[PDB]
Write a protein that binds this ligand. Structure first.
Ligand SMILES: OC[C@H]1O[C@@H](O[C@H]2[C@H](O)[C@@H](O)[C@H](O[C@H]3[C@H](O)[C@@H](O)[C@H](O[C@H]4[C@H](O)[C@@H](O)[C@H](O[C@H]5[C@H](O)[C@@H](O)[C@H](O[C@H]6[C@H](O)[C@@H](O)[C@H](O)O[C@@H]6CO)O[C@@H]5CO)O[C@@H]4CO)O[C@@H]3CO)O[C@@H]2CO)[C@H](O)[C@@H](O)[C@@H]1O
Length: 339
């Protein structure tokens, strides 16, 4: 019952003078003819949804270092490179998406700070080096900020063993391994004022002291009720006040539900689909005011039944621009209208 329309306006072409338009996809899309054609019609950047995370690239360890499994990730990078589109690297440092043995030695022992930092250098050199010149942007560090901590830092194993030095060292080493990649700090809920302030100061201070961070990634996992487009704009205004910092919108999607709500729909309510469309229109009208700093906007999924949100919350959701049958949503037409 698939109903892709090959003749409607290309998303990225509609925004060609504003910013790249990207999509996160899983590996299965690369072997599906309909998915591939839809990706290349509408998007000029991709992100591997899961297949370039540390848990996906790491195969294990021995007495002398790390062992990798790159076959699937190679297919993503080759797909982008041979089809003249960019691929954003998701992600070098991300505690929850890293296996627990990574933080212990081959004898099952928890690593000292110096041993873990040495392992981090090895990982970054190996992964960024393999793809040197082929990944235009890396999310180097993801989700290091926790606004309920007094100093703002998430108390992950990275922080507990290394303190905050792991953040700046990850950027230094990534920039050594591929000097031409744009390097991002990536996070979510950047519209919570206290978190925004922690991120702003962290990145400002890194940049001041010469750390090669080039951008902030705002995930923008949002919903039809929160945050307001004005709040997203306030984040863009503050982050873009840092000289030399660009912005990518890295994982945009818009749940039809409030977070923590027990609503559960079998079919998408039309009034929420209209609220979604109007908010996507407002969002993109706002983003077009900041094309000097916002260089890429990536949607976290090709179509609604591919959304991570369905498994994550255990219910149907319709957060993206295409329906399950590949057909355009009101949201799609709103994004085209905003262009
Ligand atoms: O991670 C495994 C799967 O990841 C998927 O993709 C990831 C991506 O790779 C990653 O980079 C990133 O990570 C997510 C985190 O791992 C996850 O824990 C986090 O949960 C968020 C949720 O996304 C977010 O929408 C939610 O927002 C709430 C907020 O918590 C709440 O405080 C706020 O409250 C406000 C009130 O609503 C308002 O009335 C009042 O005025 O102000 C309040 C604020 O003070 O409301 C918002 C929404 O209503 O918070 C939770 C955590 O608390 O989400 C991260 C990203 O959002 O993003 C992707 C998602 O995981 C992969 O695709 C998949 O394949 C992997 O298996």
């Amino acid at each position: 019952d698939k109903m892709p329309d090959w003749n409607i306006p290309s998303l990225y072409e509609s925004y060609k003078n504003d910013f790249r338009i990207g999509v996160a996809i899983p590996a299965k899309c690369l072997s599906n003819d309909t998915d591939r054609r839809m990706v290349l019609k509408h998007f000029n950047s991709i992100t591997a949804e899961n297949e370039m995370k540390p848990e996906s690239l790491l195969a294990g360890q021995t007495s002398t270092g790390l062992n990798y499994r790159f076959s699937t990730a190679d297919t993503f990078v080759d797909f982008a490179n041979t089809n003249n589109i960019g691929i954003r690297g998701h992600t070098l440092v991300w505690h929850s998406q890293t296996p627990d043995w990574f933080f212990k030695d081959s004898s099952g022992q928890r690593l000292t700070k110096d041993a873990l930092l040495a392992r981090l250098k090895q990982y970054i050199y190996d992964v960024v080096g393999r793809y040197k010149g082929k990944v235009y942007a890396w999310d180097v560090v993801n989700q290091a900020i926790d606004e309920n901590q007094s100093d703002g830092y998430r108390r992950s194993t990275w922080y507990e063993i290394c303190g905050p030095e792991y953040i700046e060292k990850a950027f230094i080493w990534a920039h050594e391994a591929d000097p031409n990649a744009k390097l991002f700090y990536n996070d979510y809920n950047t519209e919570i004022s206290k978190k925004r302030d922690f991120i702003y100061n962290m990145v400002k201070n890194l940049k001041s002291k010469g750390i090669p961070i080039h951008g902030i990634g705002m995930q923008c996992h949002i919903n039809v009720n929160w945050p307001s487009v004005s709040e997203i704009e306030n984040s863009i205004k503050l982050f873009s006040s840092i000289p030399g910092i660009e912005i990518h919108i890295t994982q945009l999607d818009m749940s039809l539900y409030n977070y923590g709500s027990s609503e559960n729909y079998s079919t998408p309510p039309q009034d929420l689909l209209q609220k979604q469309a109007q908010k996507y229109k407002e969002l993109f009208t706002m983003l077009k005011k900041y094309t000097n700093v916002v260089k890429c906007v990536t949607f976290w999924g090709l179509k609604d039944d591919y959304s991570w949100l369905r498994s994550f919350n255990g219910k149907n959701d319709w957060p993206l621009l295409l329906f399950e049958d590949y057909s355009a949503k009101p949201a799609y037409w709103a994004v085209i209208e905003a262009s």
